[model samples]
Target: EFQDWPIVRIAAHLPDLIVYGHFSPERPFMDYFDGVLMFVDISGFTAMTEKFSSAMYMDRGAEQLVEILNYHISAIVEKVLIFGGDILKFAGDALLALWRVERKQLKNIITVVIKCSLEIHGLFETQEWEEGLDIRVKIGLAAGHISMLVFGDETHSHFLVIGQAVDDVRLAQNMAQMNDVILSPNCWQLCDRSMIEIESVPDQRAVKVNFLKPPPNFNFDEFFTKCTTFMHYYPSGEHKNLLRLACTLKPDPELEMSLQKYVMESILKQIDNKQLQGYLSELRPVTIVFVNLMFEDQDKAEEIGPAIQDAYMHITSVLKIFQGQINKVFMFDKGCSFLCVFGFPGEKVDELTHALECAMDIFDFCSQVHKIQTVSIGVASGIVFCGIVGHTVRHEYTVIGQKVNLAARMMMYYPGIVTCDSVTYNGSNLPAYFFKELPKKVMKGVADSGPLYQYWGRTEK
Candidate 1:
């Protein structure tokens, strides 16, 4: 893969290194370049994490905090990439990006930066996470010549830029308030003033631009209530309402489309990858849970059909409640089965325990449906290669590893109970008494036989 290339080869292709003489062996390996610099910082990160510390378990709370931060970072990075900007660095909750003026004319650079900022501002507006925490950001843009130099030795080489341009963006960012996009005078001078409204801040030495027109005076809360009314069942109706709401808020068709896509992506907990191809996989630890609903007989299957549908609905809802993602679903004549994954796409602390909890909840939900006799669940925790697989026209996000196969095998035979591999049983913090170690059994596609564990329901602590 291209990613397997040496650092020097990779760096050679980077415009920053090639254009800035970062790899030049010559003395004074510094060069100057004219570009537009942008700084984006997420606000209230410390306050949000600290405030949630008391309300949630420490480990889980920290995971959720990181999850939110990743979401914010992903959303911001998407906008920057859309405008052909290169990310310079990620410092704490802040990001630095640059757009070379030579890549486009000065006016084009100004337009790209302004439009990107507007998209970003709109993306996070009215965004809220758990515990009623609101998402806010401060953006700064400056344009000028910047001095760049290569730093570090062969093993850990990196580049750095130093100049008034970098300093000015940082200052501009510091001067911004929540949801504010502050621009240096140079940026403002290049943009068309008639298209945007600006507020001059003499003290901050920056100009605040209103990238969005006044949002409609509509009750977003009511809009959400309507969405929820049809979210689980009537998706088509929900989609219609969403479009109507978007139109009401944004008059511009393009702006409304962008806002709709952002809102939908947020609801689905998905990131839009801009279609780069490769074996882009990451090996990470995750918890995999396989769920199967079984019916007693043909008559039972027919009678429990509606109840089964409702059961699947509740199962998905429970998974979402526990921060699990549905990996795959298979339907058969008698019943249907689905796979859930945790600690992937986003991280979950103590995911083994989380998978167990979700399984137990699913068991309880199945028990509530009198027509259904039992639910089978298998869980395993280990490393897997997770990423998109296939060509552009058809691709899926999935995991591939022996652990996934082991979970599937356990689910096939362990009906009416929750079973897991030894790794998951040992990794979780739950009491050991609740789990009974089964005899070592060889699984299909697995080379070695290993200890398996079954949950016999929790005992009184």
Candidate 2:
């Protein structure tokens, strides 16, 4: 368990308190559970980020924005967890939370989520910022079966939920306005509909909840007590650390930065000053590598089990050899994906070549692993916004820009082949014949109609 590591280091490898509190090593990664999914997203930070990203010259402040983001997220996390929701994933300003429940208690779970949503909006309304930040939240709720797919090495593991309900929650989240709560048809059908303002919005398929409603006789005190037990999902476990971390979710830079392994190396360097307020994001040129990993035995837990652990560990270690960083890992219905990048702001190295060689090594690993069904990789080079984005405790080393999307789009077009966008192809030092020219077709979201090239293999030095 690497018990020798610091509390933050150990916590970084683990998920949230609830998931860690209830996690059992004996069980398999894939499992079907009936529960409710809640999606919470904040808006208006993009405007500040526009300036924040350009801080390399403007010298604005990222600490200010981080403080604002952490403030809102802390309040929301408390409200959600207090009501028995598990922190699933934090994607930038958006949070995906889950409330696992049995078939009989579905209605109560729905009620508790709706109540949590209202309180979340109230937090924003009551606190008006000084200026330059118009923080608001939109919540989406859906109820159905969910699949928790855990993938990673023995030292680290990933927990992601994928299902029709997971998709519906995001769809519903997009359908909402600032400070609004939208419920999917699944959740809408199971409710009493007393507080739901149907026909109030343009969408007929979903319901907008303006107020909280539940059965008059339903006891929240009783429901909340059972929820704490269900939050852990275990009949027995430690509940001490859960509440301790909850109360102190406030920004403790020294504590949270220690846990996030992705940021540890750079973090140690950046915090040398110790008094540095915030990490400013930079818009600079870098190489993005997307490895779309798919497993055929998704439904078969045994087949999907050890292979993922082996594949992820192999990919993680191999990628580090070429100086690439794993920015984020995502799990979906079919398989998982690794978002990696090279060339942090002022680094002196050939990022394009490094990424190319790195891709070859990662693809080679995937091909060797028999359980993996597809190994699709896309490499592109461009200027992107890179820095920490999210809450102080569960933040991420984010690299966001148009090129990130292009890399992702390139991945799905062709499988079992390494594809590179025109920028990457041009920047590569490899010989001409080392690549096979691809026919030009309109790439979605790519303005340039230039041709994409397939990397045959690396030319020997």
Best by lDDT: 2
Compose the digit string of candidate 1's lDDT tens values, residues 323-401. Answer: 8876655433344566678876544666777789889888788877866766888898876655443222112344555
lDDT (0 to 1) per candidate: 0.60, 0.67
Clashes, model 2: 1
TM-score of model 1 relative to the true fold? 0.43
CA deviation > 4 Å runs, candidate 1 = 1-22, 26-28, 51-55, 211-461
Query: Which candidate number would show the highest TM-score if scored against the true structure?
Result: 2
Error of 1 at 11 (Å): 8.1
Error of 1 at 430 (Å): 42
Q: Please give, for residues 288-336, the per-residue lDDT of candidate 2 as tens digits.
A: 8999888763345456556666777777797667767666776655666
RMSD values, in order shown? 24.1, 6.2
* Steric clashes per prediction: 0, 1
